[PDB]
Amino acid sequence: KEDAFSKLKEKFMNE
Amino acid sequence: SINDSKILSLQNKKNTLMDTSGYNAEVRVEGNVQLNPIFPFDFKLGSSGDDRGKVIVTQNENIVYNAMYESFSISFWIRINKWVSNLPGYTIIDSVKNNSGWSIGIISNFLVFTLKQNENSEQDINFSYDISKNAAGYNKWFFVTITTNMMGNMMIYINGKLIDTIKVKELTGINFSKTITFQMNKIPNDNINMWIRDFYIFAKELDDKDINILFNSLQYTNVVKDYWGNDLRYDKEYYMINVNYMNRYMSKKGNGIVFNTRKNNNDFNEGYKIIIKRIRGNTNDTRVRGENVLYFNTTIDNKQYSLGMYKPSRNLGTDLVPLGALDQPMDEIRKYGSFIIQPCNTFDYYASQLFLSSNATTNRLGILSIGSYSFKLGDDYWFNHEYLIPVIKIEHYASLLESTSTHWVFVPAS
């Protein structure tokens, strides 16, 4: 679940 | 129980309208009366033609009044279409004989209950719907409950909520008519339909506690409802609208879904439509229920897209991900476009809340809200533009649980 949030931030948010 | 005081129970049973209270009132049906073969098993009346429809309910014997003191309560589910704010006068449920009894009617945005003692003595009470919140007409199912005490107050409830209370002063008693006529009759000073189901009469005054129990017991609250109060269905075109933005329709620019201001409130028929698709659920009968995992399809320019997350040209804020229209396969829909639905009904509207699903499971990662954000979509290049978009707040969203910006309704296209 915590990995799910970081995965979404990695994919759908700018760096 | 409150059913001990129930003296009439008009219900469609085996494709036949009849009294199920035990008192066996005669129920005669004439003209164009259509019975629904599925829940809520309603009956439909019209207002045009000589063959418009007429249900005569003759209460059998005096038995029915044998447990009555000075109190009675009437309750029923009802839907009217198209209930415009400038509607002419209509008597819809009449139970008056020799200028004595009671009568329910509709005029403008008012539903009026009139209680007649005689030629010279009558008191009425009403519910007037909010015109600003129902610009396209009050065309949704609502539960009426009317309670009357001759030595007390005359009260009216809508969807379990008390609307008005008037003290019975002018009236001393009421000699009731044994006949109740359901028929849409124009009052002496475009066509409308009326649906009714579960018309009950009780031989006592129901309190708020009993009215709310009755209200909820006659519903399947787990079944999500459309904007008019009908059962929400999979594989059917709806207009997806946010409660806070009723004058906005759904459009598209690039990957993003964007909300534009609608032309008028004649109807909701404008913009792109969605189709709800099932992934998980305990039942499989086409109806959408709470805790179902689902996704949304939308047809745009002869191509179907699915609603799913996408990376915006620049960040919109902490823990925010925009919801766009994407042409992608099922594996991607399960990962980034699946939602867990949850019914969310209030007095004003039948709505729902949608939570972001983790791999098409019942585990929640966020909630679907709406908001305006400045970024680039489609052929935008030089400047950022404010776009009203559907947006998912992930991880931290307890404050948005209570916000009406997460309440989504579905208006059937038909």
Automatic annotation (TrEMBL), chain B:
Residues 14-206 form the Clostridium neurotoxin receptor binding N-terminal domain. It comes from the Bacteria. It is found in: Host cytoplasm, Host cytosol; Host cytoplasmic vesicle, Host secretory vesicle, Host synaptic vesicle membrane; Host synapse, Host presynaptic cell membrane; Secreted. Residues 220-413 form the Clostridium neurotoxin receptor-binding C-terminal domain. Belongs to the peptidase M27 family. This is Neurotoxin. It comes from Clostridium botulinum. The lineage of its organism: Bacteria, Bacillati, Bacillota, Clostridia, Eubacteriales. The gene is nt. The chain holds residues 863 to 1284 of 1285 of the full protein.
